[PDB]
């Protein structure tokens, strides 16, 4: 029914952790630069909690915030209240990026076409997790080692998976 490509953009550790105390458990500027390059010129779909943690509209992209709050407004951002409203706002979009967090990943899980997942080889303490996924019917179309140095202190890989018809 929807015409835009629904993509997931996420980074997670060995146990699927994505967050701790409403922020990122790791600081990886190189990973963030890859995120910015990939998502540039495409809508970002983020949960209300996810947005407030970031604190600011991310440049060069349509920021769409998902909340049940019927009176929620933020300057320089669009607000949706359901999967369908998001699909309406993004009717004509080429590809959208579901950007998190867990509640929003859950919401859009039945609709994912493509998965951009960074895997981080470390066991972080966390409270927020990326939902399990049946990877049957999925093909890995890209993999590469991320940059490890003084500023990026963990081992990590970029993966991209596409669903088959």
Residues interacting with ligand 5WA, by CB under 6 A? Answer: 9-11, 23-24, 31-32, 35, 46, 50, 53-54, 99-100, 118
Q: How far is CA 113 from the centre of its chain?
A: 13
CB of 110 to ligand NDP, least distance (A): 12
DSSP conformation class of 23: B
Give the number of other Cβ atoms within 10 Å of residue 17's Cβ. Answer: 21
CB of 97 to ligand 5WA, least distance (A): 7
Find the DSSP H helices in 61-155: 83-89, 102-108
Spatial separation of the C-alpha atoms in residues 133 and 108, rounded to whole Å = 12
Spatial separation of the C-alpha atoms in residues 164 and 85, rounded to whole Å = 26
Whichever of 32 and 143 has its CB closer to ligand 5WA, that residue is 32
Tell me: does residue 102 bind ligand NDP (CB under 6 A). Answer: yes
Whichever of 33 and 164 has its CB closer to ligand NDP, that residue is 33
Name the closest residue to ligand 5WA (Cβ). 11
Going by the annotation, the residues of the binding site are 11, 18, 22-23, 48-50, 67-69, 101-104, 111, 113, 128
- Enumerate the known binding-site residues for NADP(+): 11, 18, 23, 48-50, 67-68, 101-104
């Amino acid at each position: 029914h929807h015409h835009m490509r629904v993509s997931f953009m996420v980074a997670m550790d060995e146990n699927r952790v994505i967050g701790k105390d409403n922020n990122l458990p790791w600081r990886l500027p190189s990973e963030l630069q890859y995120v910015k390059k990939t998502t540039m010129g495409h809508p970002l779909i983020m949960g209300r909690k996810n947005y407030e943690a970031i604190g600011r509209p991310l440049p060069g992209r349509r920021n769409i915030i998902v909340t049940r709050n019927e009176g929620y407004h933020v300057e320089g951002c669009e607000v949706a209240h359901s999967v369908e409203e998001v699909f309406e706002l993004c009717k004509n979009e080429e590809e959208i990026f579901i950007f998190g967090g867990a509640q929003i990943f859950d919401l859009f899980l039945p609709y994912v076409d493509k998965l951009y997942i960074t895997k981080i080889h470390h066991a972080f303490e966390g409270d927020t997790f990326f939902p399990e996924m049946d990877m049957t019917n999925w093909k890995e179309v890209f993999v590469e080692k991320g940059l490890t140095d003084e500023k990026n202190p963990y081992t990590y890989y970029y993966h991209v998976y596409e669903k088959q018809q």
